[PDB]
Amino acid sequence: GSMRHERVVIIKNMFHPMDFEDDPLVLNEIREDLRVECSKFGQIRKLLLFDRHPDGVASVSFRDPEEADYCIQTLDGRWFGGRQITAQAWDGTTDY
Ligand SMILES: [Cl-]
Ligand SMILES: [Cl-]
Ligand SMILES: [Cl-]
Ligand SMILES: [Cl-]
Ligand SMILES: [Mg+2]
């Protein structure tokens, strides 16, 4: 087994907060789309979007550390909604 953070992926550049200015529903569109996409890598335990964060941060927690690893390897550098995203392992201590 593993400490919790080994199951957690930090995804950046999913959005910019300006995206939700005119239409709050856009935030939920990106949440849903990220749920659908991250379901490819493993069983999602938690998914959060830090909707005010300039860097477009989301956290995704999986059931198993191997799922997080597969997500990081596959999503990093992909394009979503015109944005080139990154995916990194969480460190267990950085808050967004
Ligand atoms: Cl931007
Ligand atoms: Cl795919
Ligand atoms: Cl969620
Ligand atoms: Cl959220
Ligand atoms: Mg890992």
UniProtKB/Swiss-Prot annotation:
Residues 7-92 form the RRM domain. Widely expressed. It is found in: Nucleus; Chromosome. It comes from the Eukaryota. Residues 3-96 are annotated as: U2AF homology motif (UHM). Component of the 17S U2 SnRNP complex, a ribonucleoprotein complex that contains small nuclear RNA (snRNA) U2 and a number of specific proteins. Within the 17S U2 SnRNP complex, interacts (via UHM region) directly with SF3B1. Component of a complex which is at least composed of HTATSF1/Tat-SF1, the P-TEFb complex components CDK9 and CCNT1, RNA polymerase II, SUPT5H, and NCL/nucleolin. Interacts with GTF2F2/RAP30 and POLR2A. Interacts with TCERG1/CA150. Interacts with (poly-ADP-ribosylated) RPA1; promoting HTATSF1 recruitment to DNA damage sites. Component of the 17S U2 SnRNP complex of the spliceosome, a large ribonucleoprotein complex that removes introns from transcribed pre-mRNAs. The 17S U2 SnRNP complex (1) directly participates in early spliceosome assembly and (2) mediates recognition of the intron branch site during pre-mRNA splicing by promoting the selection of the pre-mRNA branch-site adenosine, the nucleophile for the first step of splicing. Within the 17S U2 SnRNP complex, HTATSF1 is required to stabilize the branchpoint-interacting stem loop. Belongs to the HTATSF1 family. This is 17S U2 SnRNP complex component HTATSF1. The lineage of its organism: Eukaryota, Metazoa, Chordata, Craniata, Vertebrata. The chain holds residues 260 to 353 of 755 of the full protein.
